[PDB]
Design a protein around this nucleic acid. Structure first.
Lengths: 18, 107, 93, 82, 98, 95, 86, 93, 107
DNA sequence: TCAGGATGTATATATCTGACACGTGCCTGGAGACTAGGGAGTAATCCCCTTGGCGGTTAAAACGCGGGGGACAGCGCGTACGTGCGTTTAAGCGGTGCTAGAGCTGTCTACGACCAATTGAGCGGCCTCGGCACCGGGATTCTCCA
DNA sequence: TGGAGAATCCCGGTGCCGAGGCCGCTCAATTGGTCGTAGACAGCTCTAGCACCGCTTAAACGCACGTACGCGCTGTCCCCCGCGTTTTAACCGCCAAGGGGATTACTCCCTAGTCTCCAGGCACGTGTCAGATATATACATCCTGA
């Protein structure tokens, strides 16, 4: 759960920069 | 009528038309549906973004602004799922993860 | 002769992710080999899935099942979400 | 044009450098001959598959893609050469 | 008295150095001569691209490094720090090569 | 009474002589259904599917125990231990 | 209507069964801690195979796991099994 | 629906090799799976060989190279001999 | 006019036409040569004869007249080249090779 | 080393079955014949990349020499695992019932192949400057002898 | 536990070649149609998976005991490591020859596609005998005594 929540924030910055 | 790329319709960076051509010319099936190259281009763009993000972090951790194969090896082998995806893959000029066994360290 | 590659798309994704970071030519060839390898893996698995059910069409369902077969765990879930989001955005317009 | 006894070109310090990269602290004396044996076996397999791939294409030059295809066929996919 | 290190310090410094770096560890020309000598036993008068020899050297060095890692694990498992040929034979036996 | 190891060698010869399955069918079937409950509920299984899973699992475990016995002999023991299984699965690439 | 939930069937892989599997592999002496490790390894293997079999079944929109799905899962993990079709 | 198999051909080869020996049903299914597996291996390797040289037909040269790539040593030599003998007898009449 | 099967033209027992149809309907290439099914059927017939000869010998050595899967397992694992070909193949109801280590036996 | 008691193993024979071998209709798939279009075979050229040689530098390989540290054999001790016995428990076998779902069939339409016209995205070629390699030097840091 | 000394991290200037940007020129992606067939969907059939029950007996479980094996410890010796000195060949730069990879054009024969014909192989029944199980049994193996 510690690594799993990290990968969602990885995706959202891609959607945040776009 | 003026033309828009299929990648622009899906909001992608990877080419949907090239992926569709390679799927047609790869002898994978008799027919290729319209949504399949869109899905495949999205998956390829996501995996490229993941590896490039981890490699950029590893390059920042060595005070470099240019990604070398060493940074790609450090990006893949330090992540569990990416190392599981590329367990049989040899990266040229990649090197080895620095890890020395505990019984060899002096006491 | 013209040799196609994935260099400009990897560069566009890199500028989307790390806006001030460059990439060497050897690392670019490695990323190109990675994209080609993953493409062949997913396409071969989708071809097997189409042949097993005696279908003659590779659709997005076969690609989604091949992604769920080939990618482990959270990578599979995020890739399925990305592909479904892209397909709905493509078919909406 | 015949070559002979080039397996001693892989010297003892090169083998021990590979072992230092592998993390080995102490190396016995017979490791060098054993390593030369396993290296010749591995290279024989890969070079045989590469030369088969070249002979099918009716070429006399072993290109890098033949080596990549041989390593792919042996389950040892190598990135960075095409 | 001159300065002499104890056995094991220079080994650890070599381990850290060669795990930090990323270049090839075998000399190019003896490996090229070995590749040509081995390929002579399959078809005579073959030519090699330079990148083919570089690919063969990269794959061979990566294979030998992974083999030495499994060897070191076997040697540690037998309560030793010195790798021996039976460790390599056990590693290749478990892997499925012999 | 026999010395320890004679009945062991007799069992080794006997179970290497024959070909039948060594795990009981119904506990393996209940285990297979319990594992498959965690992916999709209300699944059905053909009997040949459970038999194929049993054959594959027994072959995998027998090969694993052979590799375990090799790593145990390498440490000059005759008793396999969990570190032997961990070493065999680590060298095989599963761990 | 009886939604039976199963639990703790890994203990059904009994200690005599693990002893027989080790005897077929040639093991002469077995430690007492071997059995829990063997149950864990078998659980990991069965999870990895059954997940792919259920994926192949869900793709075909069927409710039953056929033998060919198990054969294809074992093929996909590089553990090809002869004598069940295909 | 009829399902096809290599049962009668395996039985004819067995009658050619051991005239007074039968075969059970499970061993027959194992032989059928073996024939299908080797066929898929050789056909996939020949497909990859034809795709690598940018050609669009699988000829006997691709099959011969696939046999030399897949089979080890004496099996490869004798299988190449058998295939060449059969192709020669076929095109000689 | 008067037909004659392609297996009889090559002196084969295996069906040439079935291998031709499978090669066409398997999506391996766009076109299929005429000699490729003959060559592949010859290779399959040779491999079938090679394994069935050893299986018949193993069945004869155990005083049996029907080949059971145990005999196929003995035939494959006792010949080094067939074992090299089928190193990742599990034969159902095959058992194992009888082989005890020397350090386990008493002296 | 020799040998008796004892137990488990392969060997000699009955008998009973259900699984293998074999014969029948048919129908689907293999074979024969003919036509067309393009994929591959063949020839000619060109120029790139491989092979070979030579000279100088110098870093790496090789050889020899102490010497300590690790492999290995031997021994003792105690825990833990094999072995056997009697109690317990559930796996297996057969028999029945039921319905969920797999599979086949017939319609019917939406979706992808095919093709021609059109054009801008992508690729090869050519500057260009800055990020990184390299090196000289000093501060920090770890190792070895007290 | 503290100093001497080798190695390494960090700063800073300098060159250089490789990444990045731009520009011209294809040719592959796009768009717009027609067409036919693969696939979705409905509906019926009928098989096999699930659930239950009773009996039996084989296997699992628990417990007691003894011994054999794991493991820790000590001593020995030899062999691998560290270091200095000398040899040697890898490496780099340069030059010269030419073989063969790559491209283009031309052409023809090989293979896809269609139609027609027929017979090879597959589901279905039916007999019958190879071996599974059971019973009797001499013989190989192991343990204790000498």
């Amino acid at each position: 759960l510690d690594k799993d929540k990290d990968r969602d924030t990885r995706r959202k910055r891609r959607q945040g920069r776009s | 009528a003026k033309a828009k790329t299929r990648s622009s319709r899906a909001g992608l960076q990877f080419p949907v038309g090239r992926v569709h051509r390679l799927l047609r010319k790869g002898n994978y099936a008799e027919r290729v549906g319209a949504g399949a190259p869109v899905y495949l281009a999205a998956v390829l763009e996501y995996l490229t973004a993941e590896i490039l993000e981890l490699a950029g972090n590893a390059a920042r951790d060595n005070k470099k602004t240019r990604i070398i194969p060493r940074h790609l090896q450090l990006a893949v082998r330090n992540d569990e799922e990416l190392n599981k995806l590329l367990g049989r893959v040899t990266i040229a000029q990649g090197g080895v993860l620095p890890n020395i066994q505990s019984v060899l360290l002096p006491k | 002769t013209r040799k196609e590659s994935y260099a400009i798309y990897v560069y566009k994704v890199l500028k989307q992710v790390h806006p001030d970071t460059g990439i060497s030519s050897k690392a670019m060839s490695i990323m190109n080999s990675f994209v080609n390898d993953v493409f062949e893996r997913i396409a071969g698995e989708a071809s097997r899935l189409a042949h097993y059910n005696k279908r003659s069409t590779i659709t997005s369902r076969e690609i989604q099942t091949a992604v769920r077969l080939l990618l482990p765990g959270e990578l599979a879930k995020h890739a399925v979400s990305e592909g479904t989001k892209a397909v709905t955005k493509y078919t909406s317009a | 044009k015949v070559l002979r006894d080039n397996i001693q070109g892989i010297t003892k310090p090169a083998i021990r450098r590979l072992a230092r990269r592998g993390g080995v602290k102490r190396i016995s004396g017979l490791i060098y001959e054993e390593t030369r044996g396993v290296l010749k076996v591995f290279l024989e397999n890969v070079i045989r598959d590469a030369v088969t791939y070249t002979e099918h294409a009716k070429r006399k030059t072993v290109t890098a893609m033949d080596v990549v295809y041989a390593l792919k066929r042996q389950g040892r996919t190598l990135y960075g050469f095409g | 008295k001159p300065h002499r290190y104890r056995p094991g310090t220079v080994a650890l410094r070599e381990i850290r150095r060669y795990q930090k770096s990323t270049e090839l560890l075998i000399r190019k020309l003896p490996f090229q001569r070995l590749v040509r000598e081995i390929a002579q036993d399959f078809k005579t008068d073959l030519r090699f691209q330079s990148s083919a020899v570089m690919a063969l050297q990269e794959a061979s060095e990566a294979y030998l490094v992974g083999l030495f890692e499994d060897t070191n694990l076997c040697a540690i498992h037998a309560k030793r720090v010195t790798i021996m040929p039976k460790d390599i034979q056990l590693a290749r036996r478990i892997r499925g090569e012999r």
